Design a protein around this ligand. Structure first.
Ligand SMILES: CCC[C@H](CC)Oc1ccc(C(C)(C)C)cc1NC(=O)c1nnn(-c2cc(C)c(OC)cc2OC)c1C
Ligand SMILES: CCC[C@H](CC)Oc1ccc(C(C)(C)C)cc1NC(=O)c1nnn(-c2cc(C)c(OC)cc2OC)c1C
Lengths: 292, 287
């Protein structure tokens, strides 16, 4: 029931996803692991609050059948709270490079000016990484299954209710419950990627028209491939989830900047995304990875 | 009821133990770990199957579960690590003997022969003092070694003689003084290979055993501790037998998969000073 142009748009996105999403995480290697004033004190108090909501354990399953498991330390008012940040910095950097490659395969992104390509990727990096993370999230176990690596949420005294307080966790549980198709995920990525209101975008009207066509394709896909009355508001549910993900991005980017200020963890590519010291001069690694 | 010489002998051994047993294992570092990624041999290597817990100062916990047996080299996953732990324990044993006055006055080659013969036994006796029998775990400070479940429960595990020894010795509820006297009796064994001053070592061994018997009579009056001295002596005789069996196991495993540290190879080798140059150096050094 889709136009052929809509069918070709989905084929290009799905082809982009197939070439750039390492679903098994087999090529994620050489990552770090946790080892075997008053205004400054107010900074450390906010950071401790940020790191407490997303507590996870790390399981690494070996080829031989052995299992290494890392339980995080409880907070003792020290730097133990940053134990898993180097590993997560390597994981985030590995995910974003796949995101950069994803966008480059899309023709509409390639035809944009390089400065708008940077602004869009800078604005949607966290969101496309979270959207890809949702497809490997097991809601029954609260575990992100990244091939041999596993990230299991820790049982905070309170259960599901206390975890749902955190907007990041509620997002992953709510998005998983919609049981989306691969095509719907990749259309969510395109809609998030081609956001006209990202800071620094200049071709606003072109990006807005592209986003509209991606959203119309998603709306039309749901009408054609889902039972019509039950999924009558599925598109609007997806759009509300994307709007909430944009809010979570701003909050967590602010969290990341505060942590980076007192404890530097970000990789050089992450520093470009966060704004740490012209768009091309400010983001020289991203420019190179887009010019390849 | 102990003689003044017996009281001083217990005091020197207890002082020796305090100075040379790192119960916290705080100075055990730079050890190999399992990497991130035959009938009776494998049957025992499976009975002695343990998980490794590493607790960091911050409160974090690294846990290693061993691979299940599919033949292959998975059975040897923790052996390199266990060789480093054993070598660290034996270095503490060397220091324990060096501070004892009766040992340092022996010829250096008999010091080598005695340490070579009692190395496994003295390490097992120290390991028993950190063994939690209800949890089946050797609690070595930040490191923990927890036995893995197997088919037959306690009955199948008790088949392994080393595991049976640890459970039986823990049941006797021994005091530190009794452990350190068991160590002395094992250390000053006249019948160890290569010993020349047999008579002097035999006289030393007898006086350690007499002190242990006298200590038990003076401090252990309950019906629970009846025949306790003779039970301990029988346990030492059983441990000497287990030493021979497990030393042969180690030589067979070393032949097919090398795991031994350089100091362990000197112990396993069958002049004495030239044969054991590392042990010779550690004995010549000070405390
Ligand atoms: C494998 C899934 C893990 C789960 C999944 C939700 O996550 C964690 C789970 C636990 C932890 C703890 C470290 C334990 C607190 C962190 C995280 N998670 C991050 O450390 C993260 N997740 N995304 N990002 C990130 C990535 C990019 C490109 C970016 O560019 C603007 C900005 C980013 O943060 C603002 C980042 C930096
Ligand atoms: C804290 C552990 C206590 C448990 C209880 C026994 O042990 C294990 C439990 C499990 C495992 C597995 C690796 C899992 C099979 C091994 C071991 N144990 C050793 O790997 C060992 N234990 N002692 N020794 C040793 C030490 C010396 C000086 C020596 O000198 C001649 C010869 C030795 O072996 C013949 C050695 C080499």
């Amino acid at each position: 029931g889709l136009t052929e142009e809509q069918r070709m748009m989905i084929r290009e996105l799905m082809d982009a996803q197939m070439k750039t999403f390492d679903t098994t995480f087999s090529h994620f290697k050489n990552f770090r692991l946790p080892g075997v004033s008053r205004e400054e004190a107010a900074k450390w108090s906010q950071v401790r609050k940020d790191l407490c909501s997303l507590k996870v354990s790390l399981q690494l399953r070996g080829e031989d059948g052995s299992v290494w498991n890392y339980k995080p330390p409880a907070d003792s008012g020290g730097k133990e709270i940053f134990s898993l940040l180097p590993h997560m910095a390597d994981m985030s950097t590995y995910m974003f490079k796949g995101i950069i490659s994803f966008a480059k395969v899309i023709s509409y992104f390639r035809d944009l000016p390089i400065e708008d390509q940077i602004s869009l990727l800078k604005g949607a990096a966290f969101e496309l990484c979270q959207l890809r993370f949702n497809t490997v999230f097991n809601a029954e176990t609260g575990t992100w299954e990244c091939g041999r690596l596993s990230y299991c949420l820790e049982d905070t005294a309170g259960g599901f209710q206390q975890l749902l307080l955190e907007p990041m966790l509620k997002f992953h549980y709510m998005l998983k419950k919609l049981q989306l198709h691969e095509e719907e995920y990749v259309l969510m990525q395109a809609i998030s990627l081609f956001s006209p209101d990202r800071p620094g975008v200049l071709q606003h009207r072109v990006v807005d028209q592209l986003q509209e066509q991606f959203a119309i394709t998603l709306k039309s896909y749901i009408e054609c491939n889902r039972p019509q009355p039950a999924h009558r508001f599925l598109f609007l549910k997806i759009m509300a989830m994307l709007t909430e993900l944009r809010s979570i991005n701003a909050q967590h980017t602010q969290r990341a900047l505060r942590i980076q200020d007192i404890h530097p963890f970000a990789t050089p590519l992450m520093q470009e995304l966060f704004g740490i010291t012209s768009l091309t001069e400010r983001h020289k690694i991203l420019h190179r990875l887009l010019q390849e």
